[PDB]
């Protein structure tokens, strides 16, 4: 071997300095708030706008809306007028005997500003470097956590595979990341179908999900509304602009950097339980202009793929330790809950976790790869894998070739600009690296 002082120790990835990064998801994640109704037995899927109105009637604290956090780069009265127009159009729907399957809105000056002007019938890019904000890790943690509700539905009614899918499903059915899959499937289905069927119209689209309570009873959830803009989507890259209007209890003043793209309205008073007792807290509406494409909407409609792809990664882990002990450990892993995995960290060091925590962490990572999909992620993922293989080989005292390590770091650090998800993944790599070559 070469003298120890000549051996190359991989340095940390360098993250760029700059203003804290902002939320760029297509919908709210940890900050969402659901207005919900309990579905009739044998219901099925209702008329979305009928479910939307029923969900809104379960809230008793509606009040005159006001701007409480301006969008710095927006015309804030247009956001306030847009919300008042959604309420006026829902009232017009309520006043008709028959609730329609879709609703075309009046193309007012406020919506034209937010979405764009009429056009004749046919014959991410943000460049500045941003620093990693604490909210990204916090979002990821919330995605890994369990909800009171089940998000995966049973089907119509080989020992290993069946037992594995069932063990995995039991661990992730209540997982917040599973809520994000079903929320994403529903809204991308509604937006793509509307984009194809009503190319010129501004359609009012409820943001809906369904789940089952602890009591096995069916719930319909309303997160808010999207207004679709003009949608002549010829190629799969063509952008449809939309306005998102999303319920929340989050005070936007806590993390102003997170909410740079949004106008926040105060729309209601919510009665909340606290240790001391009952308190009135504001219900907010998070409003922004955003955009998506046929290909992104198709990916969103496919988000149940995250469940198969994360099950695959768990299967491989049970396969490796089933070889060594020459006895398939499936039952023992999910049953014993005695075997642990390094899955978390604190200032105190690495935190070991149950197989359940591993199932939910890998699902959350797959789902965040989909919600925050980007070219920078594809580059970071390919190049970072090459570095991880060198670190594993060094950790095992194998002396891998380091002569081109310089060119590998350049290719990875090229991907670290301003994407909140890629910057978190880079930070995660750094933490692993400090523990790997201790």
């Amino acid at each position: 071997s070469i003298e120890p002082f000549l051996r190359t120790t991989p340095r940390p990835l360098r993250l760029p300095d700059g203003p804290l990064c902002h939320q760029r998801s297509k919908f709210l994640l940890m900050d969402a708030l659901k207005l919900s109704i309990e579905d009739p037995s044998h219901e099925g899927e209702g008329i979305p706008l009928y479910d939307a109105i029923k969900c809104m009637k379960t809230f008793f604290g509606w009040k005159e809306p006001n701007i409480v956090k301006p969008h710095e780069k927006g015309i804030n009265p247009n956001y306030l007028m847009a919300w008042k127009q959604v309420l006026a159009e829902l009232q017009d729907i309520e006043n008709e005997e028959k609730i329609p399957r879709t609703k075309n809105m009046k193309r007012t000056s406020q919506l034209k500003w937010a979405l764009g002007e009429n056009m004749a019938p046919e014959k991410s890019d943000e460049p500045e470097p941003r620093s990693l904000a604490s909210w990204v890790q916090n979002e990821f943690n919330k995605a890994c956590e369990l909800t009171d509700s089940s998000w995966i539905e049973l089907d119509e009614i080989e020992h290993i595979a069946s037992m594995r899918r069932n063990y995995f499903t039991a661990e992730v059915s209540h997982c917040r990341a599973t809520e994000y899959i079903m929320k994403g499937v529903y809204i991308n289905t509604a937006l793509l179908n509307a984009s194809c069927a009503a190319m010129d119209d501004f359609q009012l689209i409820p943001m809906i999900s369904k789940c089952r309570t602890k009591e096995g009873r069916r719930k319909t959830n309303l997160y808010g509304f999207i207004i679709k803009g003009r949608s002549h989507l010829r190629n799969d890259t063509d952008v449809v602009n939309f306005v998102s209007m999303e319920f929340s209890l989050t005070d936007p003043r806590l993390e102003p950097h997170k909410w740079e793209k949004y106008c926040v309205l105060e729309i209601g008073d919510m009665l909340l339980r606290t240790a001391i007792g009952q308190v009135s807290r504001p219900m907010f509406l998070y409003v922004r202009t955003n955009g998506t494409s046929k290909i992104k909407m198709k990916w969103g409609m496919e988000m149940r793929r995250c469940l198969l792809q994360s099950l695959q990664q768990i299967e491989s882990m049970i396969e490796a330790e089933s070889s060594v002990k020459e006895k398939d450990m499936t039952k023992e892993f999910f049953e014993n809950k005695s075997e642990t995995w390094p899955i978390g960290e604190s200032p105190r060091g690495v935190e070991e976790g149950s197989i359940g925590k591993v199932c939910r962490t890998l699902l959350a990572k797959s789902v965040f790869n989909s919600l925050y999909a980007s070219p920078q992620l594809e580059g970071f993922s390919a190049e970072s894998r090459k570095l991880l293989l060198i670190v594993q080989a060094l950790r095992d005292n194998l002396e891998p070739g380091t002569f081109d390590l310089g060119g590998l770091y350049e290719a990875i650090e090229e991907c670290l600009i301003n994407d909140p998800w890629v910057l978190l993944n880079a930070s995660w790599f750094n933490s692993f690296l400090t523990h790997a070559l201790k």
Partner: peptide, 10 residues
């Protein structure tokens, strides 16, 4: 804090 890259330590 959950960090899936830590799985590579085991």
């Amino acid at each position: 804090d959950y960090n899936p890259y830590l799985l590579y330590l085991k």
